[PDB]
Design an enzyme around this catalytic site. Structure first.
Site, PDB file in Angstrom:
ATOM      1  N   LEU A   1       0.809  -1.204   0.000  1.00 27.37           N
ATOM      2  CA  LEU A   1       0.000   0.000   0.000  1.00 27.37           C
ATOM      3  C   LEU A   1       0.850   1.265   0.000  1.00 27.37           C
ATOM      4  O   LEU A   1       0.446   2.298  -0.545  1.00 27.37           O
ATOM      5  CB  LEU A   1      -0.933  -0.003   1.213  1.00 27.37           C
ATOM      6  CG  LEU A   1      -1.826  -1.220   1.506  1.00 27.37           C
ATOM      7  CD1 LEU A   1      -2.582  -0.996   2.792  1.00 27.37           C
ATOM      8  CD2 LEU A   1      -2.802  -1.552   0.375  1.00 27.37           C
TER       9      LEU A   1
ATOM     10  N   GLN B   1       5.371   2.644   0.599  1.00 24.21           N
ATOM     11  CA  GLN B   1       6.774   2.481   1.032  1.00 24.21           C
ATOM     12  C   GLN B   1       7.418   3.822   1.402  1.00 24.21           C
ATOM     13  O   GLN B   1       7.290   4.813   0.675  1.00 24.21           O
ATOM     14  CB  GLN B   1       7.637   1.735   0.000  1.00 24.21           C
ATOM     15  CG  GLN B   1       7.422   2.143  -1.469  1.00 24.21           C
ATOM     16  CD  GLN B   1       8.235   1.286  -2.444  1.00 24.21           C
ATOM     17  OE1 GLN B   1       9.107   0.517  -2.031  1.00 24.21           O
ATOM     18  NE2 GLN B   1       7.945   1.411  -3.738  1.00 24.21           N
ATOM     19  N   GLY B   2       8.085   3.832   2.555  1.00 24.43           N
ATOM     20  CA  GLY B   2       8.821   4.996   3.033  1.00 24.43           C
ATOM     21  C   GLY B   2      10.307   4.690   3.116  1.00 24.43           C
ATOM     22  O   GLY B   2      10.812   3.802   2.418  1.00 24.43           O
TER      23      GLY B   2
ATOM     24  N   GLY C   1      10.102   1.804   6.307  1.00 27.25           N
ATOM     25  CA  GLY C   1       9.384   0.560   6.113  1.00 27.25           C
ATOM     26  C   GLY C   1       8.175   0.725   5.230  1.00 27.25           C
ATOM     27  O   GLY C   1       8.039   1.721   4.513  1.00 27.25           O
ATOM     28  N   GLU C   2       7.286  -0.256   5.297  1.00 26.58           N
ATOM     29  CA  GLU C   2       6.190  -0.373   4.335  1.00 26.58           C
ATOM     30  C   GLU C   2       4.869  -0.684   5.024  1.00 26.58           C
ATOM     31  O   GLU C   2       4.842  -1.256   6.124  1.00 26.58           O
ATOM     32  CB  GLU C   2       6.489  -1.492   3.328  1.00 26.58           C
ATOM     33  CG  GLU C   2       7.828  -1.369   2.605  1.00 26.58           C
ATOM     34  CD  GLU C   2       8.325  -2.695   2.053  1.00 26.58           C
ATOM     35  OE1 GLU C   2       7.695  -3.750   2.316  1.00 26.58           O
ATOM     36  OE2 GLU C   2       9.364  -2.683   1.361  1.00 26.58           O
ATOM     37  N   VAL C   3       3.766  -0.329   4.375  1.00 29.39           N
ATOM     38  CA  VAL C   3       2.499  -0.864   4.828  1.00 29.39           C
ATOM     39  C   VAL C   3       1.887  -1.795   3.796  1.00 29.39           C
ATOM     40  O   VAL C   3       1.797  -1.468   2.624  1.00 29.39           O
ATOM     41  CB  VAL C   3       1.535   0.215   5.289  1.00 29.39           C
ATOM     42  CG1 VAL C   3       0.311  -0.436   5.910  1.00 29.39           C
ATOM     43  CG2 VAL C   3       2.222   1.098   6.315  1.00 29.39           C
TER      44      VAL C   3
ATOM     45  N   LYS D   1       2.047  -2.571   9.264  1.00 36.14           N
ATOM     46  CA  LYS D   1       3.214  -1.693   9.238  1.00 36.14           C
ATOM     47  C   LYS D   1       4.500  -2.492   9.452  1.00 36.14           C
ATOM     48  O   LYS D   1       4.537  -3.450  10.244  1.00 36.14           O
ATOM     49  CB  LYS D   1       3.092  -0.590  10.283  1.00 36.14           C
ATOM     50  CG  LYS D   1       4.153   0.481  10.176  1.00 36.14           C
ATOM     51  CD  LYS D   1       3.655   1.845  10.635  1.00 36.14           C
ATOM     52  CE  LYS D   1       4.844   2.780  10.836  1.00 36.14           C
ATOM     53  NZ  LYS D   1       4.494   4.229  10.825  1.00 36.14           N
TER      54      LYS D   1
ATOM     55  N   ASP E   1      -0.905  16.694  13.578  1.00 39.48           N
ATOM     56  CA  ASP E   1      -0.853  16.540  12.129  1.00 39.48           C
ATOM     57  C   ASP E   1      -2.194  16.065  11.603  1.00 39.48           C
ATOM     58  O   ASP E   1      -2.286  15.133  10.819  1.00 39.48           O
ATOM     59  CB  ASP E   1       0.265  15.571  11.725  1.00 39.48           C
ATOM     60  CG  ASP E   1       0.753  15.801  10.287  1.00 39.48           C
ATOM     61  OD1 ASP E   1       0.433  16.880   9.664  1.00 39.48           O
ATOM     62  OD2 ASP E   1       1.459  14.872   9.777  1.00 39.48           O
TER      63      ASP E   1
HETATM   64  C1  1AW Z   1       4.055   5.057   5.779  1.00 36.72           C
HETATM   65  C2  1AW Z   1       4.214   4.574   4.322  1.00 36.72           C
HETATM   66  C3  1AW Z   1       4.705   3.119   4.379  1.00 36.72           C
HETATM   67  C4  1AW Z   1       5.259   5.460   3.623  1.00 36.72           C
HETATM   68  C5  1AW Z   1       2.825   4.726   3.590  1.00 36.72           C
HETATM   69  C6  1AW Z   1       1.758   3.922   3.745  1.00 36.72           C
HETATM   70  C7  1AW Z   1       0.811   4.431   2.941  1.00 36.72           C
HETATM   71  N1  1AW Z   1      -0.479   4.026   2.758  1.00 36.72           N
HETATM   72  C8  1AW Z   1      -1.189   3.278   3.628  1.00 36.72           C
HETATM   73  O1  1AW Z   1      -0.694   2.822   4.664  1.00 36.72           O
HETATM   74  N2  1AW Z   1      -2.466   3.044   3.279  1.00 36.72           N
HETATM   75  C9  1AW Z   1      -3.411   2.330   3.933  1.00 36.72           C
HETATM   76  C10 1AW Z   1      -3.252   1.851   5.243  1.00 36.72           C
HETATM   77  C11 1AW Z   1      -4.280   1.123   5.859  1.00 36.72           C
HETATM   78  C12 1AW Z   1      -5.479   0.882   5.186  1.00 36.72           C
HETATM   79  C13 1AW Z   1      -5.639   1.365   3.890  1.00 36.72           C
HETATM   80  C14 1AW Z   1      -4.619   2.085   3.273  1.00 36.72           C
HETATM   81  N3  1AW Z   1       1.330   5.527   2.367  1.00 36.72           N
HETATM   82  C15 1AW Z   1       0.652   6.308   1.520  1.00 36.72           C
HETATM   83  C16 1AW Z   1       0.660   6.069   0.145  1.00 36.72           C
HETATM   84  C17 1AW Z   1      -0.066   6.910  -0.698  1.00 36.72           C
HETATM   85  C18 1AW Z   1      -0.798   7.978  -0.170  1.00 36.72           C
HETATM   86  C19 1AW Z   1      -0.810   8.212   1.201  1.00 36.72           C
HETATM   87  N4  1AW Z   1      -1.498   9.228   1.708  1.00 36.72           N
HETATM   88  C20 1AW Z   1      -0.087   7.373   2.046  1.00 36.72           C
HETATM   89  N5  1AW Z   1       2.500   5.710   2.733  1.00 36.72           N
HETATM   90  C1  1AW Z   2      -4.442   8.997  15.859  1.00 36.99           C
HETATM   91  C2  1AW Z   2      -3.716   8.059  16.820  1.00 36.99           C
HETATM   92  C3  1AW Z   2      -4.661   6.945  17.251  1.00 36.99           C
HETATM   93  C4  1AW Z   2      -3.261   8.914  17.999  1.00 36.99           C
HETATM   94  C5  1AW Z   2      -2.507   7.366  16.161  1.00 36.99           C
HETATM   95  C6  1AW Z   2      -2.557   6.379  15.268  1.00 36.99           C
HETATM   96  C7  1AW Z   2      -1.286   6.113  14.984  1.00 36.99           C
HETATM   97  N1  1AW Z   2      -0.841   5.156  14.136  1.00 36.99           N
HETATM   98  C8  1AW Z   2      -1.299   4.881  12.901  1.00 36.99           C
HETATM   99  O1  1AW Z   2      -2.202   5.522  12.347  1.00 36.99           O
HETATM  100  N2  1AW Z   2      -0.659   3.858  12.314  1.00 36.99           N
HETATM  101  C9  1AW Z   2      -0.899   3.372  11.097  1.00 36.99           C
HETATM  102  C10 1AW Z   2      -1.556   4.112  10.107  1.00 36.99           C
HETATM  103  C11 1AW Z   2      -1.789   3.567   8.836  1.00 36.99           C
HETATM  104  C12 1AW Z   2      -1.376   2.270   8.539  1.00 36.99           C
HETATM  105  C13 1AW Z   2      -0.713   1.524   9.527  1.00 36.99           C
HETATM  106  C14 1AW Z   2      -0.480   2.074  10.800  1.00 36.99           C
HETATM  107  N3  1AW Z   2      -0.534   6.931  15.725  1.00 36.99           N
HETATM  108  C15 1AW Z   2       0.806   6.984  15.778  1.00 36.99           C
HETATM  109  C16 1AW Z   2       1.395   6.960  17.058  1.00 36.99           C
HETATM  110  C17 1AW Z   2       2.773   7.019  17.198  1.00 36.99           C
HETATM  111  C18 1AW Z   2       3.570   7.090  16.055  1.00 36.99           C
HETATM  112  C19 1AW Z   2       3.018   7.107  14.778  1.00 36.99           C
HETATM  113  N4  1AW Z   2       3.834   7.181  13.719  1.00 36.99           N
HETATM  114  C20 1AW Z   2       1.622   7.051  14.629  1.00 36.99           C
HETATM  115  N5  1AW Z   2      -1.247   7.666  16.406  1.00 36.99           N
END
Ligand code: 1AW
Ligand code: 1AW
Length: 261
Positions: free
Chosen positions: A17, A19-20, A23-25, A39, A130
């Site tokens: 989904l 890549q940074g 790491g990746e999702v 993640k 953010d």
């Molecule tokens: C933190 C990294 C690994 C760099 C990352 C991850 C993603 N995208 C997601 O995690 N998408 C996603 C996560 C959970 C459910 C559905 C979609 N993105 C991403 C790709 C494209 C657009 C956006 N806003 C965010 N970037």
């Molecule tokens: C809005 C709250 C519930 C406070 C929140 C949620 C997250 N973490 C995420 O959203 N993680 C995540 C998002 C998309 C895909 C996989 C993991 N964080 C979070 C906490 C600490 C570090 C990071 N990077 C992200 N904080």
């Protein structure tokens, strides 16, 4: 070494989904049966602990409008496992194929839910730092949830936070006002045509985005309230929540669909 830990083979990382550099999702499957977001840590690009600071913070925060941490894998390869949001980024959802069809009734409803998630955050005395469309996840039947991908986002940041680092639930509220803008221009970058420096100089001297095309003054005004110079003049999420849920009866009950809003 918690009760969030899961055997690894019980995960099948299916579609990538994002890549940074950290790491990746991946989308995937947990315990053979259930859709998940996974993640990843690219080893060496940060400590094990500083990556698991995410899971610790998500462990103390549960609410239906905040993305839920399901599980973790606490040794390399490390993983943080959340619920799956079938629609991705609110931002990408606004801009792509589903954009044409969103109307003010849907967009205000999405907004109410973010407000609701953020009202939980308000009550737990936490600060997001953010809030913006890129950090909201969308699900089926337009469910929205507050999230954080972990990434300076100056166009969205209250000025006392961008300049002096006074980050609070009220600098979060300002960001919300900005988010209301992306919801109502279906995703367009705020302050169009202006670079960051142009923004800082201008908002500082009282400039504020005008009413977007076809969006009622009464919501633009809710924006302006979020963007008051003095952080403590800004409304709470509880207020924002209740104003958005109630919007079509109390505020704009004579609302007629237009071409875009
Ligand atoms: C933190 C990294 C690994 C760099 C990352 C991850 C993603 N995208 C997601 O995690 N998408 C996603 C996560 C959970 C459910 C559905 C979609 N993105 C991403 C790709 C494209 C657009 C956006 N806003 C965010 N970037
Ligand atoms: C809005 C709250 C519930 C406070 C929140 C949620 C997250 N973490 C995420 O959203 N993680 C995540 C998002 C998309 C895909 C996989 C993991 N964080 C979070 C906490 C600490 C570090 C990071 N990077 C992200 N904080």
């Amino acid at each position: 070494k918690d009760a969030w830990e899961i055997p690894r083979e019980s995960l099948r990382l299916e579609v990538k989904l994002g890549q940074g550099c950290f790491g990746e999702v991946w989308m995937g499957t947990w315990n053979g049966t259930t859709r998940v977001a996974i993640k990843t840590l690219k080893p060496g690009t940060m400590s094990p602990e500083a990556f698991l600071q995410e899971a610790q913070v998500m462990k103390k925060l549960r609410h239906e409008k905040l993305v839920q941490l399901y599980a973790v894998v606490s040794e390399e390869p490390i993983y943080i496992v959340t619920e799956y949001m079938s629609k991705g980024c609110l931002l990408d959802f606004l801009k792509g194929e589903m954009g044409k069809y969103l109307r003010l009734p849907q967009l205000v409803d999405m907004a109410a839910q973010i407000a609701s998630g953020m009202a939980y955050v308000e009550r737990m005395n936490y600060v997001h730092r953010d809030l913006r469309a890129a950090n909201i996840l969308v699900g089926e039947n337009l469910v929205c949830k507050v999230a954080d991908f972990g990434l300076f986002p100056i166009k969205w940041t209250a000025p006392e936070a961008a300049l002096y680092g006074r980050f609070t639930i009220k600098s979060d509220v300002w960001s919300f006002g900005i988010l209301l803008t992306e919801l109502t221009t279906k995703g367009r970058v705020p302050y169009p045509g202006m670079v960051n420096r142009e923004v800082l100089d201008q908002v500082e001297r009282g400039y504020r985005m005008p009413c977007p095309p076809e969006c009622p003054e009464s919501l633009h005004d809710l924006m302006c309230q979020c963007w008051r110079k003095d952080p403590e003049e800004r409304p709470t999420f509880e207020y924002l929540q209740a104003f958005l849920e109630d919007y079509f009866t109390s505020t704009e009950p004579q609302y007629q669909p237009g071409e875009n809003l």
